[PDB]
Design an enzyme around this catalytic site. Sequence first.
Site, PDB file in Angstrom:
ATOM      1  N   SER A  29      24.684  -0.445  59.840  1.00 41.12           N
ATOM      2  CA  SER A  29      25.835  -1.181  60.323  1.00 41.12           C
ATOM      3  C   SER A  29      25.745  -1.361  61.832  1.00 41.12           C
ATOM      4  CB  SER A  29      27.113  -0.430  59.947  1.00 41.12           C
ATOM      5  OG  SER A  29      28.263  -1.005  60.528  1.00 41.12           O
ATOM      6  N   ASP A  74      26.348   3.955  39.654  1.00 37.28           N
ATOM      7  CA  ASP A  74      26.139   4.738  40.870  1.00 37.28           C
ATOM      8  C   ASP A  74      24.919   4.255  41.649  1.00 37.28           C
ATOM      9  OD1 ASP A  74      25.996   6.650  42.822  1.00 37.28           O
ATOM     10  OD2 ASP A  74      25.358   8.293  41.483  1.00 37.28           O
TER      11      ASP A  74
END
Length: 330
Positions: free
Chosen positions: A199, A35
Site C-alpha cells: 500500500s 481464505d
Amino acid sequence: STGSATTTPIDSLDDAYITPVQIGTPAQTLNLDFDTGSSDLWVFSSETTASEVDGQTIYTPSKSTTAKLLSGATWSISYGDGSSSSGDVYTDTVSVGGLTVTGQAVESAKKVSSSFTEDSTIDGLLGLAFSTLNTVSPTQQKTFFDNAKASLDSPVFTADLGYHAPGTYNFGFIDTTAYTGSITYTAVSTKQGFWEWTSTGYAVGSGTFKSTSIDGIADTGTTLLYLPATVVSAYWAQVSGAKSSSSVGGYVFPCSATLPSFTFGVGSARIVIPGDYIDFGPISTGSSSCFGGIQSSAGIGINIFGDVALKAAFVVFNGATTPTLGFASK
C-alpha cells in the site's frame, strides 16, 4: 468457464464469510470459509473426532461415488489465530457457483481445534493463496483456483465482500457492474505464498494522506485490519477514550463513539473504509467498551489487509503468469 457464488457473513459483526461449495457425487453442500491467506481445502467430515463436531455439516466420502482416498497423504495446518486442524486426504469433484474441478484434493479433518468446533457455521476452509503453502504431505496439492485456472475464461477470481450483507466470489471474469470508477492494479510478491502487496499510505478521517509504503497481505480469512503500531496509534488517537488494552487484547473504544473513516492507498488510488466498518461491538455482552477493527500487527510479523479493508473494495486476485492485485471502490 466461470463460476459465481454468494458469500454470506456468519454473524452480525461480519466475523467471517461462508460460501456454499458442492463436494462429491451426489453433491454434498458444505459452507466453507474462502481464505486468500491459506492454501488447503479442508472439511469437517465423517472422520472428524465426534466430540469435536458441534453443528457443522460434514463431508462423508463413503457416500460419494467420485471420492478416492489419496493413499498415504496427510495434512496439518496452524493458522495465525492459533487454531489448527489435521487429517487425511481424498480427491473428489468440487464445484463453486457452477465452476467444477474434478480431482480436487479435499482434506478430511480427523482433528480440529476448539475454535473450529465452537463455530457451528463454518464447515471448513477453501484456501485461495498460492499452492506453495499447501500442507499435504508427502505430495503437496493444488488449490481449487490453481486447478481451475487453465479452464477459466480469464485466470482471475474476485472478492466482493459485503458490510453486514451478502457479497460475491466470482471465478474467471470481472463483473464490470460490481464497482465504481476504475480498478487500480498493483504488484504482488508470491515469495511467502501470499497475495502480498505494498500500500502507498493512509489517511485517518478527513486528515491529510500520509505517503508511506505498507507491505501486507490481502487475506479474506482474517476478520480485521492489522497495520503497523504507528499507523494504528494515529487512527485511535482520533477517537476520544480509545486505548490499547492488554487484558482485552487490542484497542477498545467507548461504544458511544462515532468512528472516523480510514483510507488506504493503492498506487495513486484510495480506498475509504467507513468508520462503521471498524466497529466490532461490545467486548463482552452488555459492555459499553467496544472492540476496534483496526489493530496492531506488531508481533504478527506481517501486516494483514483482512475483511475490514477488503469489504470496502472490489478486489481482483489476478493469477496470470505474473500475479497482481486490483482494487476498485464500489
